[PDB]
Design goal:
It is classed as ribosome. This is part of a larger assembly, with seven protein chains of seven kinds. Chain A is mainly α and 69 residues long. Helix content of chain A is 22%, strand content 0%. Chain A has one domain. Chain A has three helices and no strands. Chain D has one domain: Ribosomal Protein S14/S29 (30s Ribosomal Protein S14, Chain N). Classes of the chains: A mainly alpha (69), B little secondary structure (74), C alpha+beta (57), D alpha+beta (55), E little secondary structure (126), F mainly alpha (97), G alpha+beta (79). Chains A and E meet through helix 3 of A and loops of E. Strand 2 of chain C pairs antiparallel with strand 3 of chain D, so a sheet runs across the interface. Chain E binds two RNA strands through helix 2 and strand 1.
RNA sequence: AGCGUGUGCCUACCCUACGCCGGCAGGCGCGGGUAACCCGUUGAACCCCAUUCGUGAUGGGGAUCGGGGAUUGCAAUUAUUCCCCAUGAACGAGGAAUUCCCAGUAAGUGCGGGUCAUAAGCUUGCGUUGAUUAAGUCCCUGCCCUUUGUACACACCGCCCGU
RNA sequence: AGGAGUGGAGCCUGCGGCUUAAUUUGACUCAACACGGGAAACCUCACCCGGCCCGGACACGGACAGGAUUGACAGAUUGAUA
């Protein structure tokens, strides 16, 4: 119906030019962070995402202490 | 606070001095010993310079700076 | 016109500021007369500070 | 030579292109209303320019 | 095994066409860095890439190249070729993919070396 | 410093022709408010002026980003002794007296 | 060619301040007290107050013509 | 709602009013304003509300962090650049120590100037919602108008006694 | 016996503690510490892995149509069409 297509979660991802269907829990929360290719490329982004820390740079010494409590 | 400590490389340098010989031996020669002589440099066909602009010689791409001209066959 | 500046030339002491003011007052009077009369009334040995602008519009 | 170096990539926000018109100082510049004085020189000349303290 | 594709599309055929519709099946992150335009001092990195591409025998690692260009890429044809960039005080090299649109050369440096924790004393320890 | 002799004679006929001048200290910038379009490079003209007024025999006074000059007769005597131009050609500045 | 009234007033103030400093640093020895700029149709007449006037004008009005000329060539006024 | 700002001595840098159209700043054409004339009766904002909480981890206020075209600033990542899928974070008055504050205080909240390239988490101002407690004291920290003591006067961080 | 908002729950900076190119001038309680209106790529970085175009009104020295100036991609430089 050509309805405005910015309503799905992961859009314009690699491996497909469309937005396919998925279901069940224990699958979505992982795909909120598609971290296979960004680790394979030997990038700082994989370790920034992996340690539970910032990947864009939220300041973490006086403020910005939430994330593990 | 420390110093810049810029000493680990090139403690002393000598000024470069081009040994431009005062005699016309390397730059030009006549090889004729006569009133009329042959010129050892190809004629410049460009009209963007003067009538006495004479080009030097390198391995390629004769460097004058004003034109950066290179002989190419297109 | 307001210009607020630190009082100190250095950066020492209690952070104190000067609050400088400059107020520009504008009045416009409209009347119908040729240019000679306006030129004559301007030459009145005006007091300083009052900038006069006349436009034929 | 000279044109091979100068004016290549625009420095559109030059801090060093501005100076105080009284002492030619880089810092504390007052560019508002076109004063173009450093703040100390402005404080020295504020009364002559017409800015006076009221509040 | 077959080669991993790029956003469901190939490379060479799109590399033979113009840029009129090249972005319709790409990602962001060079979404418009490609569309920014061109200036001088852009071709040197690709020129050195091609020089190492031609003077290196097939299926062997090319010699180390020294430079620090923080630039952009438009064409993913150079799969199999990797960019050698200066970083810190040593050399760093990153495995390459046809996933060039959607990432940058300079997003591979860890300049956030962790704290070297000390044992402060003498003064205010409590 | 780093000043050629053709630019030297150029700035010298400028000093001969003007005598009483105002100026501002500008070196690097390529266009000038009031002493540009003189067919001579700005930097060499201003550096020659620096030589003129800072060689050590004519005094100056630097304030409010501008220059005002008293050209002593010792400098005129130096000019006459060097270039051999007599003062009989009086400057045209003696009009509207 | 034209600037807003705020910029114009500020520029007039800057001109007055710089003129005052200039003829303060020139002839402080001549008993100079202060300057007063008077507006006049298409004109800018300037009055200088000094305790000694024979020394600000000098012989044949030399000092006056010199410093008037330099003020002319400085402050962008027409010839 | 402001308070205010907005385009040549220098100078090359101003504030902004329709369409390409995915859903609007916006990559390009376009006019106005040296300004109570245009922005603008201040152009991606109240705090409100037929998306609502029946007794509090739900709809209620966001732990990162991914896409849609990015204002166009070489670089930004080794400081510039939007809201949406509801992916669930001690999810409801806080070691020792404490800083500011008495009515349009505090606090919440945005906006404008300065810096500047419309660069703010800073500061300087401005409105908007709106205020529990107190009209007292010298207890702590200090200050002042007295009397008193002093072996202090570098003035109690003083001076000074003891193998 | 008052309180409200606190530095701890949502937009990083100042300077010392604090590995080599990283903790870089002035400011040692109130009267230092988004303070020098100081929002550090760079013109303002001196902690900085690196350089070049360099200064003398004079005191004394080396001596004239040559005693060098930012000013070439491809054999490179230590990022750099230096």
């Amino acid at each position: 119906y050509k309805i405005p297509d910015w309503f799905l979660n992961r859009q314009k991802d690699v491996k497909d030019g469309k937005y396919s269907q998925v279901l069940a829990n224990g699958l979505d929360n992982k795909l909120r962070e598609d971290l296979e290719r960004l680790k394979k490329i030997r990038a700082h982004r994989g370790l920034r995402h992996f340690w539970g820390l910032r990947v864009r740079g939220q300041h973490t010494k006086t403020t910005g202490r939430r994330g593990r409590t | 606070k420390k110093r810049k400590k810029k000493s680990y490389t090139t403690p002393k340098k000598n000024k470069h001095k081009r040994k431009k010989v005062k005699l016309a031996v390397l730059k030009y020669y006549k090889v004729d010993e006569n009133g009329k002589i042959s010129r050892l440099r190809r004629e410049c066909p460009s009209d963007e310079c003067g009538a006495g602009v004479f080009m030097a010689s390198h391995f390629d791409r004769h460097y004058c700076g004003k034109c950066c001209l290179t002989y190419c066959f297109n | 016109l307001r210009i607020t500046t630190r009082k100190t030339p250095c950066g020492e002491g209690s952070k104190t500021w000067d609050r400088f003011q400059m107020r520009i007052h504008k009045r416009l009077i409209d009347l119908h007369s040729p240019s000679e009369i306006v030129k004559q009334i301007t030459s009145i040995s005006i007091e300083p500070g009052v900038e006069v602008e006349v436009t034929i519009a | 030579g000279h044109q091979q170096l100068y004016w290549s990539h625009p420095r559109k926000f030059g801090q060093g292109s501005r100076s105080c018109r009284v002492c030619s100082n880089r810092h504390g510049l007052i560019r508002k209303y076109g004063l173009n004085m450093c703040r100390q020189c402005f404080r020295q000349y504020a009364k002559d320019i017409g800015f006076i303290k009221l509040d | 095994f077959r080669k991993f594709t790029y956003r469901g599309v190939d490379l060479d055929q799109l590399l033979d066409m113009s840029y009129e519709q090249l972005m319709q099946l790409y990602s962001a992150r060079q979404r418009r860095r490609l569309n920014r335009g061109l200036r001088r001092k852009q071709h040197s990195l690709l020129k050195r890439l091609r020089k190492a591409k031609k003077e290196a025998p097939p299926m062997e690692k090319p010699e180390v190249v020294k430079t620090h260009l923080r630039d952009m890429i438009i064409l993913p044809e150079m799969v199999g070729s990797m960019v050698g960039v200066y970083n810190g005080k040593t050399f760093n090299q990153v495995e390459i993919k046809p996933e060039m649109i959607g990432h940058y050369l300079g997003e591979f440096s860890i300049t956030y070396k962790p704290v070297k924790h000390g044992r402060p004393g003498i003064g205010a320890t409590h | 410093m780093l000043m050629p002799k053709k630019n030297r004679i150029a700035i010298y006929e400028l000093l001969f022709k003007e005598g009483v001048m105002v100026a501002k200290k500008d070196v690097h910038m390529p266009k000038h408010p009031e002493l540009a379009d003189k067919n001579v490079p700005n930097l060499h003209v201003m550096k020659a002026m620096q030589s003129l007024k800072s060689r050590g025999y004519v005094k100056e006074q630097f304030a409010w980003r501008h220059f005002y000059w008293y050209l002593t007769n010792e400098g005129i005597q130096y000019l006459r002794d060097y270039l051999h131009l007599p003062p009989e050609i009086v400057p045209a500045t003696l009009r509207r007296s | 060619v034209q600037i807003s009234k705020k910029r114009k007033f500020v520029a007039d103030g800057i001109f007055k301040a710089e003129l005052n400093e200039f003829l303060t640093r020139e002839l402080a020895e001549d008993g100079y007290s202060g300057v007063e700029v008077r507006v006049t149709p298409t004109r800018t007449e300037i009055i200088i107050l000094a305790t000694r006037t024979q020394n600000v004008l000098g012989e044949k009005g030399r000092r006056i013509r010199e410093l008037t000329a330099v003020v002319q060539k400085r402050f962008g006024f027409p010839e």
